[PDB]
């Protein structure tokens, strides 16, 4: 159940110039 693996990618999606 690799659910933590998603916390690595999204971790940057929050600061990927989204605001």
Curated annotation (Swiss-Prot):
Q: What is the effect of changing residue 15 to A?
A: Reduces catalytic activity 100-fold
Q: What induces it?
A: 30-fold up-regulation by phosphate deficiency.
Q: From the UniProt entry, list the residue stretches annotated as the region Interaction with the membrane lipid bilayer.
A: 1-19
Give compartment(s). Answer: Plastid, Chloroplast outer membrane
What is known about the tissue distribution of this protein? Expressed in leaves, flowers and roots, but not in stems and siliques.
What is reported when this gene is inactivated? No visible phenotype under normal growth conditions.
Family recorded in the similarity comment: Belongs to the glycosyltransferase group 1 family. Glycosyltransferase 4 subfamily.
What is the recorded function of this protein according to its Swiss-Prot or TrEMBL entry? Involved in the synthesis of diacylglycerol galactolipids that are specifically found in thylakoid membranes. Specific for alpha-glycosidic linkages. During phosphate shortage, involved in the biosynthesis of digalactosyldiacylglycerol (DGDG) which rescues the limitation of phospholipids.
Would you tell me the protein name for this molecule? Digalactosyldiacylglycerol synthase 2, chloroplastic
Species of the source: Arabidopsis thaliana (Mouse-ear cress)
């Amino acid at each position: 159940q690799p659910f933590t693996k998603g916390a690595y990618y999204i971790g940057k999606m929050v600061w990927s110039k989204g605001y």
